[PDB]
Structure 1
Amino acid sequence: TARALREIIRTARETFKLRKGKVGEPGDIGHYAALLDFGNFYLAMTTDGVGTKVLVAEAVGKFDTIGIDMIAMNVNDLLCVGAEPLALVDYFAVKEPNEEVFKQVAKGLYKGAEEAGVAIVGGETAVMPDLINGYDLAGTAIGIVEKGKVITGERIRPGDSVIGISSSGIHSNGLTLARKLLIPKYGLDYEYEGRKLWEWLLEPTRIYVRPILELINSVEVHGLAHITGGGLLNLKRLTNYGFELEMPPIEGIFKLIHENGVPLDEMFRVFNMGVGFIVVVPQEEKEEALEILSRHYKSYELGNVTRELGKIKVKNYGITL
């Protein structure tokens, strides 16, 4: 998988030379977004899809929130270089042009766009039943960040404060594991802690644009990480310094998954475990950062960056990543 993707990554890096010294000259690949040089500012560009969450949407017949998921997966990544999201295009590859599905998808696209402050400006619709067994929804978003205001993680230093913003639930990663582990055994109508299994699996991804844009315009921020594939391992994309953290108690769908045989260390590498976005700020800014974020969503002081390198210590679970 990494082996396969490395072939494309290598080729993409070779193509950087084609814009060397020209408008659009890129930074490196591998971060939450690509940065393209437009002189006084960078354009930030990112691409992501919903994933197999859309199979749960199709199973129950509820498509009016997967547009929120797709917008969230893109605009939340733009935030992680310090960019203001501006615009998005969607790529909708479908087995058939079902009018009711499209109507529902459009509802969630509007709600997500309004929350993120972005215009949906175009896209592609491909009807290909020979290739697509469902309704696959992906997109590409662009944002803007002033030169000198990019937030890469390079400024993260030992001692910095690490703050987590609560997720809304499972978001859009780990659904293949959750689907296969739980649906055949329990049924989509199984009730767990007051919600049906499909409600746990379909709850739309949280959009962090409003709290994060307020944060970065108020306090010094050293790193921003959207918690997606790889779970807490995404922190290692920002820095090689270590982390010492306390994570929230395991609740909801995450507890059901854990009780069905997924060990905790694997959980923290797959699921967001209740924290959808992590910010790293100088310890001098910690109280104000917590104050700002908490006005939008439940937020937690998780811990600190350490001089110890490359380790993520989840102290209250006794787990090291």
Structure 2
Amino acid sequence: TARALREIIRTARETFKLRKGKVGEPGDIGHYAALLDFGNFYLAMTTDGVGTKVLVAEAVGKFDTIGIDMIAMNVNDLLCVGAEPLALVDYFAVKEPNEEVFKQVAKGLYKGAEEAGVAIVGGETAVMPDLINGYDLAGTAIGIVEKGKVITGERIRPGDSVIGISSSGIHSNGLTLARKLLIPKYGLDYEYEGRKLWEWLLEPTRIYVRPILELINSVEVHGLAAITGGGLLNLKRLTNYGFELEMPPIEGIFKLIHENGVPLDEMFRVFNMGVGFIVVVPQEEKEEALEILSRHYKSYELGNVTRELGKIKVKNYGITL
């Protein structure tokens, strides 16, 4: 995927010059959101879709949370440049205009928007059964960040504290692996540790807007990272310095996936493994950061940034990424 994407990324970089010295002049591609110069502030812009989680939703008939997944993944990405999320449009590409599906989808859209503090301001609905084998839900969000307040990881230095905020579960990455591995053997009604498999696979992605906005207005913050596609590898987008981490015990849906033969080094590159969002702060801020975040969600001191470069060492699992 990265190799195919290189030609699109290189072309996109060549279009930056079209806004050079004008409103909308962008920063570089590669971070969690694009930053556009509006003079007194930057507009942040990001887009993402739910993914094949929606095939599980359709299989069992539970659609009232995929709209939470859509809103969560987009607003969480805005947070990772330091931005306040403001507004979103949704792109809904569907096999058919099933009114019941749309009614359920709208319930989760409302819940997620209310939790994130964003208005849903427009969208697109495309009925395309030749192209879409389900109900593909995506969106684009915009946020605002003041000049001088952008947080992209540039200030991360060896010694900094690395703190994890718990995920609600699988969130919206790794669903293809989980679906193909687990559904044929167990079925979606299989009970694992008190929850059916569809409950594990459809648990809505957590929204981190309130804790992160409180955090960045309270302490010095050097980096912010949503743990999405690529798992812990997302940390390498913030910095070339290394990480030395102790990750939480493997539990819930991740434990079942591991027990069905996925090695841990692969799982840390695919799944969030219990940590949905990671923040990097100077050590003197660690205690206050943990206090703030813990009032919202279970949060952990994971480890330290290191002078050793380019590696993520998960010490308690013997893994290096």
Cα displacement (A) at 1:89:
0.2
Q: How far apart are the structure 2 equivalents of 1:3 and 1:85?
A: 31
1:243 CA displacement = 0.4
TM-aligned CA deviation for residue 43 of structure 1: 0.1
Once the two structures are superposed, residues 131-163 of structure 1 have per-residue CA deviations (whole angstroms, 9 ceiling, x without a partner) of 111000000000000000000100000000000
The share of aligned pairs that are identical, in percent, is 100
Deviations 1:67-93 (CA, angstroms, capped at 9, x unpaired)? 000001100000000000000000000
Secondary structure (helix, strand or coil) at the match of 1:130 reads: coil
CA positional deviation for 1:3? 1.6
- 1:2 Cα deviation from its structure 2 partner: 1.3
* 1:255, distance to aligned residue in structure 2 (A): 0.4
Q: What is the deviation of 1:4?
A: 1.2
Q: Please give the alpha-carbon distance, in whole angstroms, between the structure 2 residues aligned to 1:310 and 1:6.
A: 21
Cross-structure match for 1:51: 51
SS of the residue corresponding to residue 82 of structure 1 reads: coil
Aligned-pair distance for 1:46?
A: 0.1
Measure, in 2, the Cα distance between the counterparts of 1:5 and 1:245: 30
Q: CA deviation at 1:297?
A: 0.1
1:276 CA displacement: 0.1
Matched residue, 2:180 = 180
Cα deviations across residues 91-138 of structure 1 (Å, max 9, x unaligned)? 000011000000000000000000000000000000111111100000
Q: 1 CA distance for matches of 2:210 and 2:6?
A: 34
Instruction: Spell out, residue by residue over 1:175-212, the C-alpha distance to the aligned partner (whole angstroms, 9 max, x if none).
Output: 00000000011111011100000000000000000000
C-alpha separation between the residues in 2 aligned to 1:187 and 1:284?
48
Following superposition, the deviation at residue 7 of structure 1 comes to: 1.2
After TM superposition, the score normalised by the length of structure 1 is 1.00
Give the distance between the partners of 1:263 and 1:108, measured in 2 at CA.
34
Q: Which residue of 1 aligns with 2:144?
A: 144
Per-residue CA deviations over 1:41-85 (Å, capped at 9, x if unaligned) read: 000000000000000000000000000000011000000000000
Counterparts of 1:178 and 1:7 in 2: how far apart (Å)? 30
The CA deviation at 1:217 is 0.4
- Once superposed, what is the RMSD of the aligned Cα atoms? 0.4
Task: Give the deviation of 1:283 after TM superposition.
Answer: 0.3
Give the distance between the partners of 2:137 and 2:70, measured in 1 at CA: 7
Mapped partners of 2:248, 2:89: distance in 1? 35
Quote the Cα distance in structure 2 between the aligned partners of 1:250 and 1:150. 34
Q: Distance in 1 between matches of 2:213 and 2:81?
A: 11
Instruction: Give the Cα–Cα distance (whole angstroms) in 2 for the partners of residues 187 and 286 of structure 1.
Output: 43
Alignment of 1:6-85 (within 5 A): 6-85=6-85
Q: Over residues 214-272 of structure 1, what are the superposed CA-to-partner deviations in whole Å (9 max), with x where a residue is unaligned?
A: 00000000000000000000000000000011000000000000000100000000000
Q: Distance in 2 between matches of 1:154 and 1:190?
A: 45
Q: Offset of 1:33 from its aligned partner?
A: 0.1
CA distance in structure 2 between the aligned counterparts of 1:164 and 1:157, rounded to whole angstroms: 17
Q: Compare 4-13 and 47-56 and name the one that shifted more.
A: 4-13
Q: Which residue of 2 aligns with 1:313?
A: 313
Mapped partners of 1:224, 1:252: distance in 2: 25
Aligned length: 321
Secondary structure of the 1:110 match is helix
**Aligned ranges 1:101-120 → 2 under 5 Å:** 101-120=101-120
In structure 2, C-alpha distance between the alignment counterparts of 1:2 and 1:35, rounded to whole Å: 22
* Structure 1 residue ranges, 4+ long, deviating more than 2 angstroms after superposition: none
Cα separation, 2, equivalents of 1:156 and 1:50: 30
Q: SS state of the match for residue 173, structure 1?
A: coil
Q: Distance in 1 between matches of 2:133 and 2:315?
A: 43
Question: 5+ unaligned residues in a row in structure 1: which ranges?
Answer: none
Shift in Å, 1:273 = 0.2
Structure 2 unaligned spans of 5+: none
Give the distance between the partners of 1:144 and 1:67, measured in 2 at CA: 22
TM-score (norm 2): 1.00
Is 1:170–2:148 an aligned residue pair?
A: no
SS at match of 1:122: strand
Distance in 2 between the 1:152 and 1:192 partners?
A: 39
